[PDB]
Design an enzyme around this catalytic site. Sequence first.
Site, PDB file in Angstrom:
ATOM      1  N   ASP A  89      -4.776   3.834  -4.640  1.00  0.00           N
ATOM      2  CA  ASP A  89      -4.871   4.429  -3.307  1.00  0.00           C
ATOM      3  C   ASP A  89      -6.054   5.392  -3.216  1.00  0.00           C
ATOM      4  O   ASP A  89      -6.237   6.246  -4.085  1.00  0.00           O
ATOM      5  CB  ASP A  89      -3.574   5.165  -2.959  1.00  0.00           C
ATOM      6  CG  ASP A  89      -3.427   5.417  -1.465  1.00  0.00           C
ATOM      7  OD1 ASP A  89      -4.394   5.898  -0.840  1.00  0.00           O
ATOM      8  OD2 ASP A  89      -2.341   5.138  -0.915  1.00  0.00           O
ATOM      9  N   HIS A 131       0.840  -1.187   0.000  1.00  0.00           N
ATOM     10  CA  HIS A 131       0.000   0.000   0.000  1.00  0.00           C
ATOM     11  C   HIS A 131       0.880   1.243   0.000  1.00  0.00           C
ATOM     12  O   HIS A 131       1.789   1.370   0.815  1.00  0.00           O
ATOM     13  CB  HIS A 131      -0.912   0.008   1.231  1.00  0.00           C
ATOM     14  CG  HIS A 131      -1.935   1.103   1.215  1.00  0.00           C
ATOM     15  ND1 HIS A 131      -2.927   1.208   2.166  1.00  0.00           N
ATOM     16  CD2 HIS A 131      -2.125   2.136   0.359  1.00  0.00           C
ATOM     17  CE1 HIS A 131      -3.683   2.258   1.897  1.00  0.00           C
ATOM     18  NE2 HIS A 131      -3.218   2.839   0.805  1.00  0.00           N
ATOM     19  N   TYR A 189      10.417  13.537 -11.536  1.00  0.00           N
ATOM     20  CA  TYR A 189      11.636  12.743 -11.472  1.00  0.00           C
ATOM     21  C   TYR A 189      11.939  12.308 -10.047  1.00  0.00           C
ATOM     22  O   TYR A 189      12.400  11.187  -9.815  1.00  0.00           O
ATOM     23  CB  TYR A 189      12.808  13.549 -12.027  1.00  0.00           C
ATOM     24  CG  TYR A 189      12.823  13.676 -13.536  1.00  0.00           C
ATOM     25  CD1 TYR A 189      13.604  14.648 -14.160  1.00  0.00           C
ATOM     26  CD2 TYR A 189      12.094  12.804 -14.342  1.00  0.00           C
ATOM     27  CE1 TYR A 189      13.662  14.746 -15.548  1.00  0.00           C
ATOM     28  CE2 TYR A 189      12.146  12.894 -15.738  1.00  0.00           C
ATOM     29  CZ  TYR A 189      12.933  13.868 -16.328  1.00  0.00           C
ATOM     30  OH  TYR A 189      13.006  13.964 -17.697  1.00  0.00           O
TER      31      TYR A 189
HETATM   32  C1  FUC Z   1      10.023  16.945 -21.468  1.00  0.00           C
HETATM   33  C2  FUC Z   1       9.758  15.488 -21.067  1.00  0.00           C
HETATM   34  O1  FUC Z   1      11.031  14.766 -21.029  1.00  0.00           O
HETATM   35  C3  FUC Z   1      10.866  13.367 -20.638  1.00  0.00           C
HETATM   36  O2  FUC Z   1      10.384  13.282 -19.294  1.00  0.00           O
HETATM   37  C4  FUC Z   1       9.904  12.635 -21.603  1.00  0.00           C
HETATM   38  O3  FUC Z   1       9.719  11.277 -21.196  1.00  0.00           O
HETATM   39  C5  FUC Z   1       8.551  13.372 -21.665  1.00  0.00           C
HETATM   40  O4  FUC Z   1       7.670  12.709 -22.586  1.00  0.00           O
HETATM   41  C6  FUC Z   1       8.794  14.836 -22.094  1.00  0.00           C
HETATM   42  O5  FUC Z   1       9.335  14.876 -23.418  1.00  0.00           O
END
Ligand code: FUC
Lengths: 149, 149
Positions: free
Chosen positions: B69, B24, B120
Site C-alpha cells: 500500500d 487493497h 494484536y
Molecule cells: C513479547 C512478544 O510475544 C509474542 O508476540 C512473540 O511472538 C514475540 O516474538 C515477542 O516475544
Amino acid sequence: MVALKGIPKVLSPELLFALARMGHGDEIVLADANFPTSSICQCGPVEIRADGLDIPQLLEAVLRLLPLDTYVESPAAVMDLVPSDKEKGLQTPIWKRYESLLLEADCKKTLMKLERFEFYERAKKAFAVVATGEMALYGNIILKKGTLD
Amino acid sequence: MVALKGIPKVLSPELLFALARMGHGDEIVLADANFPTSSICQCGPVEIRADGLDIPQLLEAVLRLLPLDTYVESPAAVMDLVPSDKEKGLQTPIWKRYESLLLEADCKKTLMKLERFEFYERAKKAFAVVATGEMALYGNIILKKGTLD
Ligand SMILES: C[C@@H]1O[C@@H](O)[C@@H](O)[C@H](O)[C@@H]1O
Ligand SMILES: C[C@@H]1O[C@@H](O)[C@@H](O)[C@H](O)[C@@H]1O
C-alpha cells in the site's frame, strides 16, 4: 480476478489455486460453452467458473504460468470432429489460434486430436475443468503440466 | 511447494490463494514461532502453516508478488519491545533484514513499530496469519496489500 505482480489479471484466485495444486503430469481442461461440465465434474475434477471469458484469452494467461510436459508427443489436445461434422466439412478456425498461442509459449508441437469419448475419458481424470463462455465449436482444450527449470 | 513459472517455490498453494484473495488495504501477518497464532486466528484471520520456514525467506518470496500500500505512511509493521525487554536493552537484528528486503522491493518506508497489544488488535483484523518457524524474537511482521495500476 487477481492483483499480484507478474500474474495475468484474467486469472481468478480459484484458478490460480488449482494451477498451484496441480503436479507433474496432471491435466486441466479449458471447456467451451457446450461442454458437459456438470456431468464430467461429477466424476472427479473440480469445477472452476470463468463465465465471461473466451478460451484464447485464458489460454494465453495460463501458459504464462504453467510449464507444459515436454516428454509426451504433445502436451495439448482438442476434441476431433464427430463423423457428422466431418461429413458436413465443419471448420474449426479456433484451433489455429491455439497452435499460435502454444508457439508463443515455446511449444512447437501440434495439437493432438482425440475422439469425442476418448476426450471425455481424459477430462474425467483431469484435476479441474474450467467452464468458460467460449462459443466456438470444439473449443475445448486439455493441457498437461510438466516440470520447471 | 508451488511449481509455476515466475512464482517463488517456497510459497504454498494455500498462501498463494490467500495473497490472490486479499484486496487493497487487506493485511497479512507473518508470525514467528512464539506468536499466539491459535488464539488470534480464533478471532477471524485464516491460519496458514509454514512451520519449516523462517520469515526472511518467506518475506522475500511474498514481496515478489504482493504490491504494498502506498497511500499509508508505512505498509509494514513490527511489534515494539515490551517495557521489560527494552529495559534489558534487548537487540532485534532481524528488523534490519526486513528493512533491507523491503528496500529491494522498492519500499523506502521505515518499519512502523506497534505496541504489543496494538499489534494484536491489528493481527485480529488481518486476512490471514502465517505461522512460521522463525525463532528470532519480535520477528512478527504485518504487510498491507496495495494496488497494482
Ligand atoms: C513479547 C512478544 O510475544 C509474542 O508476540 C512473540 O511472538 C514475540 O516474538 C515477542 O516475544
Ligand atoms: C460435439 C462436441 O460436444 C461437446 O464436446 C462440445 O463442447 C463441443 O464444442 C462439440 O459441440
